[PDB]
Enzyme design. Sequence first.
Site, PDB file in Angstrom:
ATOM      1  CE  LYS A 149      -3.846   2.276   2.403  1.00 36.89           C
ATOM      2  NZ  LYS A 149      -4.739   2.311   3.603  1.00 36.89           N
TER       3      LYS A 149
ATOM      4  CE  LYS B 209      -3.596  10.075   1.633  1.00 32.14           C
ATOM      5  NZ  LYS B 209      -2.526   9.078   1.366  1.00 32.14           N
ATOM      6  N   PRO B 210      -7.128  14.657   0.942  1.00 26.92           N
ATOM      7  CG  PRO B 210      -7.983  15.348   2.982  1.00 26.92           C
ATOM      8  CD  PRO B 210      -7.646  14.103   2.205  1.00 26.92           C
ATOM      9  CB  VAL B 211      -2.182  16.538   1.812  1.00 24.47           C
ATOM     10  CG1 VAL B 211      -2.236  15.927   3.209  1.00 24.47           C
ATOM     11  CG2 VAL B 211      -0.749  16.831   1.407  1.00 24.47           C
TER      12      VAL B 211
ATOM     13  CB  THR C  99       4.226  13.042  -0.093  1.00 27.94           C
ATOM     14  OG1 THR C  99       3.737  14.213   0.564  1.00 27.94           O
ATOM     15  CG2 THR C  99       5.682  13.255  -0.473  1.00 27.94           C
TER      16      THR C  99
ATOM     17  CG  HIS D  39       2.545   6.063   8.250  1.00 27.93           C
ATOM     18  ND1 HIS D  39       1.295   6.572   7.962  1.00 27.93           N
ATOM     19  CD2 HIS D  39       3.173   7.004   8.996  1.00 27.93           C
ATOM     20  CE1 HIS D  39       1.173   7.767   8.514  1.00 27.93           C
ATOM     21  NE2 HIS D  39       2.298   8.052   9.149  1.00 27.93           N
ATOM     22  CG  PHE D  40       5.455   9.669   3.339  1.00 26.39           C
ATOM     23  CD1 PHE D  40       6.526   9.396   2.490  1.00 26.39           C
ATOM     24  CD2 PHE D  40       5.274  10.977   3.790  1.00 26.39           C
ATOM     25  CE1 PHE D  40       7.400  10.413   2.097  1.00 26.39           C
ATOM     26  CE2 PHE D  40       6.145  11.991   3.399  1.00 26.39           C
ATOM     27  CZ  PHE D  40       7.205  11.708   2.553  1.00 26.39           C
TER      28      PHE D  40
END
EC number: 4.6.1.18
Length: 122
Positions: free
Chosen positions: A7, A39-41, A43, A117-118
């Site tokens: 993911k 999705k708001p934000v 990267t 996870h980032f």
Amino acid sequence: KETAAAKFERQHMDSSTSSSSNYCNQMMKSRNLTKDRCKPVNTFVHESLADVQAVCSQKNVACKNGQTNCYQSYSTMSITDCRETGSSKYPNCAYKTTQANKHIIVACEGNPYVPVHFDASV
């Protein structure tokens, strides 16, 4: 069924590149991030998988939520920040593409130890 590691790759990995103001809108959808909602934000890291995976053995730092399994990268990496504009409403998600060179922080776990996870970019 998709895994945590798979993911992360899907959501934050784009090694193919190293762009245009179209990028985010095109990428956010082709990565199925605008599926059930915009999705708001997000990267995207324009580095090799090995480079990003090696962060799990780099600078250990505290995660934004308190956990201790986050790592910051020794070198800055090429990334892209996608922010949801004002002229954006589901299903038509609009994102502001913004390139940069910043160190990244990720949450790592499992066997093997890989990013799942980032956490942030500094």
